[PDB]
Structures are given as C-alpha cells and as structure tokens.
Design a protein around this ligand. Structure first.
Ligand code: NA
Ligand code: NA
Ligand code: NA
Ligand code: NA
Ligand code: NA
Ligand code: NA
Ligand code: NA
Ligand code: NA
Ligand code: NA
Ligand code: NA
Ligand code: NA
Ligand code: NA
Ligand code: NA
Ligand code: NA
Ligand code: NA
Ligand code: NA
Ligand code: NA
Ligand code: NA
Lengths: 6, 6, 6, 6, 6, 6, 6, 6, 6, 6, 6, 6, 6, 6, 6, 6, 6, 6, 6, 6, 6, 6, 6, 6, 6, 6, 6, 6, 6, 6, 6, 6, 6, 6, 6, 6
C-alpha cells in the first residue's frame, strides 16, 4: 500500500 | 500537483 | 487512484 | 487549468 | 474524469 | 474561453 | 461537454 | 461574438 | 448549439 | 448586422 | 513524498 | 512487515 | 526512513 | 525475530 | 539500529 | 538462545 | 551487544 | 551450560 | 451553411 | 485558433 | 464540426 | 498546448 | 477528441 | 511534463 | 490516456 | 524521479 | 503503471 | 536509494 | 516491486 | 549497509 | 529479502 | 562484524 | 542466517 | 575472539 | 555454532 | 588460554 504526492 | 494512492 | 491538477 | 481524477 | 478550462 | 468536461 | 465563446 | 455549446 | 452575431 | 442561431 | 507499507 | 517513507 | 520487522 | 530501522 | 533475537 | 543489537 | 546462552 | 556476553 | 474561422 | 462549420 | 487549438 | 475537435 | 500537453 | 488524450 | 513524468 | 501512466 | 526512483 | 514500481 | 539500498 | 527487496 | 552487513 | 540475511 | 565475529 | 553463526 | 578463544 | 566450541 502506498501514498504518493508530487 | 499529483496525489496517487494504490 | 489519483488526482491530478495542472 | 486542468483537474483530472481517475 | 476531468475538467479543462482555457 | 473554453470549458470542457469529460 | 463543453462551452466555447469567442 | 460566438457562443457554442456541445 | 450556437449563437453567432456579427 | 447579423444574428444567427443554429 | 512517498509512504509505502507492505 | 515494513514501513517506508521518502 | 524505514522500519522493518520480520 | 528482528527489528530493523534505518 | 537492529535488534535480533533467536 | 541469544540477543543481538547493533 | 550480544548475549548468548546455551 | 554457559553464558556469553560481548 | 456557415464557415467561421477566428 | 479555430475553425467552425455548420 | 469544430477544431480548436490553443 | 492542446487540440480540440468536436 | 482532445490532446493536451503541458 | 505530461500528455493527456481524451 | 495520460503520461506524466516529473 | 517518476513516470506515471494511466 | 508507476516507476519511481529516489 | 530505491526503485519502486507499481 | 521495491529495491532499497542504504 | 543493506539491500532490501520487496 | 534483506541482506545487512555492519 | 556481521552479516545478516533474511 | 547470521554470522558474527568479534 | 569468537565466531558465531545462527 | 560458536567458537571462542581467549 | 582456552578454546571453547558449542
Ligand atoms: Na492506500
Ligand atoms: Na479519485
Ligand atoms: Na467531469
Ligand atoms: Na454543454
Ligand atoms: Na441556439
Ligand atoms: Na505494515
Ligand atoms: Na518482530
Ligand atoms: Na531469545
Ligand atoms: Na544457560
Ligand atoms: Na484559423
Ligand atoms: Na497547439
Ligand atoms: Na510535454
Ligand atoms: Na522522469
Ligand atoms: Na535510484
Ligand atoms: Na548498499
Ligand atoms: Na561485514
Ligand atoms: Na574473530
Ligand atoms: Na587461545
């Protein structure tokens, strides 16, 4: 599971 | 801006 | 899932 | 401006 | 889904 | 001016 | 769907 | 002037 | 659909 | 002057 | 930023 | 098991 | 940062 | 059994 | 840091 | 039996 | 550090 | 039987 | 028939 | 820039 | 028909 | 930059 | 149809 | 940088 | 379709 | 650095 | 698809 | 350093 | 998939 | 020093 | 998989 | 000095 | 597996 | 001096 | 396995 | 002086 923000 | 969850 | 804004 | 969700 | 404005 | 949703 | 004005 | 919706 | 004026 | 709708 | 659990 | 952040 | 248990 | 952190 | 029991 | 820490 | 019993 | 520490 | 460029 | 035909 | 570049 | 056709 | 680069 | 098509 | 590099 | 496609 | 290096 | 793919 | 060296 | 793969 | 030297 | 694998 | 020299 | 393996 | 000289 | 093995 992951969260990614740019 | 980008927010990506998986 | 994602949100993208430009 | 662009807002794109998928 | 998206919204685009110019 | 242009507004485009899809 | 769109609206366009010139 | 022009207004165009579709 | 459109409206055009000159 | 011209007004044209379609 | 990235947060990744597995 | 793990948590990873960047 | 990384935390890993096994 | 172990715990590892970086 | 690492803690390992066996 | 053992415990190990680094 | 290491503690080892047998 | 023994105990060992380092 | 109508052809409109702008 | 645009071309429009009806 | 409509072709719009910007 | 974009191209749009309807 | 829509092609949008940015 | 991105390319978007609909 | 969407291709996004950053 | 990343590449994202949808 | 997503490829992320850091 | 890391590589991540989804 | 994830490959992480430190 | 370490290598980690998931 | 994890390989850790210290 | 040590090597650890999981 | 663990190999520890001191 | 010692060598330890698990 | 353990080998200890002193 | 001694040697010890387990
Ligand atoms: Na999530
Ligand atoms: Na969403
Ligand atoms: Na919409
Ligand atoms: Na409309
Ligand atoms: Na009308
Ligand atoms: Na977890
Ligand atoms: Na544990
Ligand atoms: Na123990
Ligand atoms: Na004992
Ligand atoms: Na033109
Ligand atoms: Na263009
Ligand atoms: Na581009
Ligand atoms: Na890139
Ligand atoms: Na890298
Ligand atoms: Na390394
Ligand atoms: Na070593
Ligand atoms: Na030694
Ligand atoms: Na000796």
């Amino acid at each position: 599971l992951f969260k990614f923000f740019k």
